[PDB]
Amino acid sequence: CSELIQASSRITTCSTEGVNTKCRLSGTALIRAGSVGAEACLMLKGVKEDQTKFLKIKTVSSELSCREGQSYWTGSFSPKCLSSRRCHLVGECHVNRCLSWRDNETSAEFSFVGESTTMRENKCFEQCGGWGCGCFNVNPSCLFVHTYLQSVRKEALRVFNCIDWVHKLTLEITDFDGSVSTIDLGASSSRFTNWGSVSLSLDAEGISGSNSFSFIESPGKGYAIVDEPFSEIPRQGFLGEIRCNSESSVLSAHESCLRAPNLISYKPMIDQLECTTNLIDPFVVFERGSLPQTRNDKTFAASKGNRGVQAFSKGSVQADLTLMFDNFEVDFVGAAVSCDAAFLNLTGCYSCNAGARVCLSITSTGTGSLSAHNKDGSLHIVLPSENGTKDQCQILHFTVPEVEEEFMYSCDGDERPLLVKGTLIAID
């Protein structure tokens, strides 16, 4: 019992029938849910100190299934650039046409590649002029450049965060009687039980800093958590600095795919050129986050079967439990104790509605009941015995002025002789 609460006296009402007593739970109790794998017990206190019962609430697992939100695609890519230098005032290499380049216009130096639906950009770097650079004009030449992006791997990866995290709580209930059942509780769910019902008063379980966590999916392999929330806009130096709509778009490096600006660095060396990119290899990021992980006290594992993403608590659970009790009865008390009884007096009348009052002196070591039948089996007696000596009395109906009846009393079940006797009186 990781967390123990005693059953309040306010919701509890009990009554003694001798020997044992039955208490009736009627009310509502609020208890902190036990940690993962632990129990959250409710101790029922009876009239005696030795009378105790337990309602044990084991926590099987706290599952947080993900409802996915924003999502982009990505893959590996490599830059390849094409270069063709022309001296000043040659071709497109005129007064200011170089430095005033536009990234979307393909140069006439590259009017042979044909049509491309691939991500691409255009540059123009001014190199040294003069006869030292094979140009008649001392003015700067123009190294026209046509670069694009091609996919490295023939596979893509889907990225996403989670708009919402649905909490399912599996519990194993052990009733007071010992019967066991297993249910599942959502934040607004209300399950019924043998003793009443149960629901979640308060559910705070969820991913703290879900706005500081994102996730990746490799189709048909698994998932991966990134130590960083979702980037809704392509940021350079991050996962998804380049992103597309579909898988095929990533594989095709199609020009519809978005990308951050200035991803490709250039080293224009006269006629030579080296275009490079320092991209975040998303296939490395996935391996680092190969699905089984631990952040905070949550172990992120994949959905058994139909693939999705779930989180499992490891320790404490931030949720209250409403235990509604609908006058549910629970028993049981101690064994019956042997009882010594002696006849005191028989005072009363015969055949009258008032009847006769018989008194006995009963002695026991615990609260009990005394049961005595007469030889005829016509009249029987029931009186409470107690931890000590007490004088009990009830009503007994006779029909003969001279009484001398031998009974057989027993608290523990072993009949023992007692002789009642008395002179009954008339009423008229």
Rounded Cα distance, 396 and 381, in Å: 8
Nearest alpha-carbon partner for 173 in 57, 40, 61: 57
Resolution to 1 decimal place, in Å = 4.2
Is domain 3-62+162-204+315-331 given the CATH code 1.20.1250.20 in the classification? no
List the determination method: X-ray
Positive or negative torsion for Cα 32, 38, 42, 46: negative
End-to-end Cα, the chain, rounded Å: 68
Q: Let me know: does 411 contact 385? Beta carbons within 8 Å.
A: yes
User: Cα 198 from chain centroid?
Assistant: 16
Architecture of domain 340-423 in CATH?
A: Sandwich (2.60)
The pair of three-digit structure tokens given for residue 74, joined into one six-digit string? 């990505």
The amino acid that residue 311 corresponds to is A
Q: Which residues of 278-307 are buried (b: 16+ CB within 10 A; e: fewer)?
A: ebeebbebbeebebeeeeebbebbeeeeee
3-state SS of 159-202 is EEEEEEEEEEEEEEEECCCCCEEEEEECCCCEEECCCEEEEEEE
In the chain, residues under CATH classification 2.60.98.50 are 3-62+162-204+315-331
In the chain, residues under CATH classification 2.60.40.3770 are 340-423
